[PDB]
Design a binder for this molecule. Structure first.
Ligand SMILES: Cc1cc2nc3c(=O)[nH]c(=O)nc-3n(C[C@H](O)[C@H](O)[C@H](O)COP(=O)(O)OP(=O)(O)OC[C@H]3O[C@@H](n4cnc5c(N)ncnc54)[C@H](O)[C@@H]3O)c2cc1C
Ligand SMILES: Cc1cc2nc3c(=O)[nH]c(=O)nc-3n(C[C@H](O)[C@H](O)[C@H](O)COP(=O)(O)OP(=O)(O)OC[C@H]3O[C@@H](n4cnc5c(N)ncnc54)[C@H](O)[C@@H]3O)c2cc1C
Ligand SMILES: Nc1ccnc2ccc(F)cc12
Ligand SMILES: [Cl-]
Lengths: 436, 433
């Protein structure tokens, strides 16, 4: 498709934050003409299903349909909207009452803030009246894998996109051993997914990471340790306290050497070791980057310059209640994207409604969280019967909450963090989550 | 006070006035309200440490008028009172105007409701707001830990009242000690030194650095400046760190960490500035933990309808990085820029501001950009000279020593960002051969 020379609303990146902004812009300006520029070839879609529901689908064609049943039981697509919801970029300036167009397979490579203009990888130039940067991030790699050969790189997956789910799902049906490097939520979710698939095929799934347990940087040690046992019981060989020294090929198999004496033989590697914000457009744009948290530095309204906002994983924003942060959650991309779209239509609203996070580690372990969640903060945990709540404290105030197997109570956790009261007994607060 | 005003400027100093003029020039019917905690109308401060001390008129303390370098006499006030309109008539007068509400302090900022609250309970809503609160002079821990008599005999020099009180003190006591080697402390030393020569009194200046402006100028130039300050009738004591200050038989006794002790009658502390950021709490506005002040972007904007300018603004310089500048011309430039952006300009800080200092009649300094003695420097001299401050193989700051009317040249060198193969050739641009 050809890109129009001018568009009122330009959204750079075609992910969750961009789509939520497009929906928000259209809801507030019913005749709005919104162009999304996406380097990926796919229309906007949500990523959480790529490590969860799509692996537990009953439909054996799930790799083709990309449909899944939600907790409510209703089936849906990973795509936020079907193609019929969008208009073509060529017809965008002509269609009555405007619409939302997605220019796929195109990357914005230059940003001219003074002239309100971008340049694409094919030389096309597009002027805008208001611009959203929603470029997300790029998965990090391991130094050991960067130093390894080309064969190792070709057998290492950085799990982010639909193509990664399709390649890894097919690999899980062809090889006998897959090793996941990374103890975060993504690595743990993939371990449970591959663990379930391995039980039916009789294959091997290994997860190794330097922490003492899964999500060691997020959950307290005792809860991190308990989570590791549940991941192990999903058919996963979990190796905590594991630092990769090198990776090589030995008789067709990948050989992982750890800083200790242990060695791991496997057929394929999946690296889930964090994200790097896509901030390359800051150079040509003269946009400030945050050296502490990374990403584009924006204010409480997600604004960088007069006609430029940033949302999603790439936005380092000022939280008037919690301080300067950068969040990499799905619901944050939705909330921050929606907020940006509103401010692109004159709302002038600060980030106020805190976004939630969630993770499913099998069918028996569900986590929900909100606010500042970091195992380095002091914590108070209250548990009962299997379930519990963990409060993260700062300045004698709750700044983060993790709900373990407690659902439909995120608004309560959100209000506790908003009120910012110095509680004399967190066990009484725990009763708000039906913990007695 | 009006209940509502389109343009509200918090603080009545250089940045506020420049913003009001800028707003009025772009929106000729604009109605601008300045809220100033001081009782005085907007005025420039540089004369308070220079021209007003070298005036021939013995009534200068009353007139607050001085002769410029051009020789034309003027007031420290930016405009006469007749230039302003009253706050009562501001919402009614044809074609609007600029009003100043003196003796009133904004004590609360409600960003959500576009509303401020004054110290007298008055509430004022706005459509666009400029925070130009400047800063407050810092004090010394040694003087804060001292008694009330020490505090009462220590001057923090910033306002008209400080000039009047210090001028009177210089005619009543025999020894004044300035603590601080910066531009303010050195200018006051030369001023009191000239005034002391006619009375035969004493002026002492002590600071921790090896010389005047040790944090700004390279060591060799800082030392040379110290000798010139001494020749103005000043006893300069470098490498001096105050350990404590007390009163001994009616005299102030300053005890230094190195064992030295100084007897004096009055102290002037010129040891830096603290940005007035108290409104950030109620306003939910971010402060910069590195440089201090309100954190704003390249357009000096904090929130949708709030800008910050002057000494209190920590802004992003797209060419030089995040900074906070405390110069007179920066308050003028940033204030003007804010006013333009408050009327839809959407312009980033681009025109670099200059600063200057006069240390007597024989030493004039002008500088621009990032000027810091910790940066690598190259000095080219001929009585006069230029000092280049380098970073990433590029000139990021320039100091001109006794070279005038060439700041646009220095400004262009920093803008071009060229990697010069020979800075001696560049010095020829400043008539240094
Ligand atoms: C497998 C997986 C599972 C997840 N599961 C969960 C979960 O269970 N719960 C949760 O809370 N979060 C989860 N997350 C995190 C959540 O998906 C992210 O926070 C969210 O996708 C971030 O949205 P975004 O719009 O900021 O960026 P992205 O979704 O990454 O979208 C950015 C898009 O812009 C493109 N782009 C980048 N630069 C340019 C450019 N210059 N020009 C054009 N296009 C460009 C990128 O290619 C990408 O297509 C998961 C993430 C992954 C990868
Ligand atoms: C004695 C002296 C000599 C100087 N000489 C030079 C020189 O030679 N060259 C140079 O480049 N620079 C010089 N400077 C620095 C220059 O004067 C300052 O950079 C300039 O005044 C900054 O302007 P401003 O608007 O940011 O703040 P200010 O001029 O300080 O104005 C702020 C005003 O706002 C008021 N205010 C604060 N908070 C509130 C509130 N909540 N409500 C209402 N009002 C409030 C403050 O009382 C003050 O009146 C000198 C400064 C001083 C003090
Ligand atoms: N000459 C000066 C006197 C007092 N304060 C100053 C602050 C900044 C500056 F650049 C110059 C000053
Ligand atoms: Cl000291």
């Amino acid at each position: 498709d050809k890109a129009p020379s001018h568009v009122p609303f330009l959204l750079i990146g075609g992910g969750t934050a961009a789509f939520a902004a497009a929906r928000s812009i259209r809801a507030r300006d019913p005749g709005a003409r919104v162009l999304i520029v996406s380097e990926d070839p796919e229309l906007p879609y949500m990523r959480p299903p790529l490590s969860k529901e799509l692996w537990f689908s009953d439909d054996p064609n799930v790799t083709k349909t990309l449909r899944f049943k939600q907790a409510n039981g209703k089936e849906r697509s990973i795509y936020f909207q079907p193609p019929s919801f969008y208009v073509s970029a060529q017809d965008l300036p002509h269609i009555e009452n405007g619409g939302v167009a997605v220019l796929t397979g195109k990357k914005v490579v230059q940003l001219d803030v003074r002239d309100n203009m971008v340049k694409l990888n094919d030389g096309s130039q597009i002027t805008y009246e208001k611009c959203l940067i929603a470029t997300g991030g790029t998965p990090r790699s391991l130094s050991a894998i960067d130093r390894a050969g080309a064969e190792v790189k070709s057998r290492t997956t950085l799990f982010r996109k639909i193509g990664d789910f399709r390649s890894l799902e097919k690999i899980s049906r062809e090889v006998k051993s897959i090793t996941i490097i990374g103890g975060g939520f993504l690595g743990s979710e993939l371990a449970c997914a591959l663990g379930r698939k391995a039980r039916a095929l009789g294959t091997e799934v290994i997860q190794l990471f330097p922490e003492k347990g899964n999500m060691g940087k997020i959950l307290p040690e005792y809860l991190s340790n308990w989570t590791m046992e549940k991941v192990r019981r999903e058919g996963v060989k979990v190796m905590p306290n594991a630092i990769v020294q090198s990776v090589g090929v030995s008789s067709g198999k990948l050989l992982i050497k750890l800083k200790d004496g242990r060695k791991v033989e496997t057929d394929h590697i999946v690296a889930a070791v964090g994200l790097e914000p896509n901030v390359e457009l800051a150079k040509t744009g003269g946009l400030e980057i945050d050296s502490d948290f990374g990403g584009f530095r924006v204010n409480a309204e997600l604004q960088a310059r007069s006609n430029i906002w940033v949302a999603g994983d790439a936005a380092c924003f000022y939280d008037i209640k919690l301080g300067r942060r950068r969040v990499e959650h799905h619901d944050h991309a939705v909330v921050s994207g929606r907020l940006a779209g509103e401010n692109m239509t004159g709302a002038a609203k600060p980030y106020w409604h805190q976004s939630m996070f969630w993770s499913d580690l099998g069918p028996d372990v569900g986590y929900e969280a909100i606010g500042l969640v970091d195992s380095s903060l002091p914590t108070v945990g209250v548990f009962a019967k299997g379930k519990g709540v963990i409060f993260y404290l700062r300045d004698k105030v709750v700044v983060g909450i993790v709900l373990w197997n407690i659902f439909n109570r995120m608004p309560i956790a959100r209000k506790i963090i908003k009120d910012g009261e110095q509680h004399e007994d967190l066990n009484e607060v725990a009763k708000l989550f039906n913990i007695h």
